[PDB]
């Protein structure tokens, strides 16, 4: 059972939804997880790091591990897609903070996941500025309970 909006749409458009205007996205049964954001040559992706909430979160459920990412400057994000290999994970938009301009997105990731690919875009100069490949690499492997070294 899922009641949150599944992102199949531009992020700039789904933040207009009233279901998730300043909606409580607390989840106490969870922990911090640090992360990098990187281009295809292994370098860092400067905008995707600079405008992502530090740290991310890992939310623990009875079936599989869920990651929350807070994306700053949400009205300006167009495309936002997340993949494990090249199998497209569905992205649930949980909250949009109106004062601060922050979208908070959730995706269920497989057990033992080290990193995750991001096809994305932003709205600059009335044009689509594409980012082909961003790897959201995590500080350590993502499992669903308390067993993280």
């Amino acid at each position, epitope marked *: 059972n899922n*009641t949150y909006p599944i992102l199949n749409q531009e992020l700039r458009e789904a933040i*207009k939804n*009233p*279901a*998730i*205007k300043d909606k409580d996205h607390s989840a106490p049964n969870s922990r911090p997880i640090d992360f990098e954001m990187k281009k295809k040559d292994g370098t860092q992706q400067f905008y995707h790091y600079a405008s992502s909430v530090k740290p991310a979160r890992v939310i623990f459920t009875d079936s599989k591990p869920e990651i929350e990412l807070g994306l700053q400057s949400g009205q300006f994000w167009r495309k936002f897609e997340v993949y494990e290999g090249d199998k497209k994970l569905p992205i649930k938009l949980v909250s949009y903070d109106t004062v601060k301009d922050y979208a908070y997105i959730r995706f269920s990731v497989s057990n033992g996941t080290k990193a995750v690919k991001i096809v994305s875009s932003t709205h600059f100069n009335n044009k689509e500025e594409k980012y082909d490949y961003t790897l959201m690499e995590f500080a350590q492997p993502i499992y669903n309970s308390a067993d993280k070294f």
Partner: antibody
Amino acid sequence: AEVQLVESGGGVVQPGGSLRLSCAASGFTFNKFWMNWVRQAPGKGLEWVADIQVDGSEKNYVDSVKGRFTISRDNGKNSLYLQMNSLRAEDTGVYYCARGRYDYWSGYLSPWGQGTLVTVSS
Amino acid sequence: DIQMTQSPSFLSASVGDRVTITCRASQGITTYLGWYQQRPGKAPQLLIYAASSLQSGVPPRFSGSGSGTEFTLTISSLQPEDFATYYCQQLNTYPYTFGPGTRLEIKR
């Protein structure tokens, strides 16, 4: 569009009375959209009555109606219900069924049904 | 509640005019606002959501304008089907209240 919202159940009642309005929905996945009831006293304009979440887990009412009406679902039968008890003279009017504007969007309503008249009067 | 109020109220105009109707909210709203159209005896139909986002199917002459409290619906070149009463809803805080309306009649 193939989207259909067909209401019935409207009629005449007396003050202190009961009425259940129904709403048939076809041509979209029903368990993926919010559903809303809006109303219209004859001559006057639109007033939001209630909405209900995708799987029946959250409901909202207007302060007028709270504690007398109950909003309700049945995703398998593709229906939306409005159970109206303790009816008043101010509740007489056209009662529109109305679907959320996109999958899991809350507020904005298209399309609506064609209305069902509800008269309260002794 | 959040009270929604509408200035023009009753407004006379012919086929071809540049018509402007407004809508005003007692608190700050961002762009969490919709516009609706309803002809005599018929159901309503959404025109504009997110203050200025145009709804799917609706013709290109409908503008949406505003952010905060003052808001605007602007029809570029009027037509015979455009003559109707027009409502605004806020979708900031429950109850998601409508406005009193602006009725649009054919001048003669």
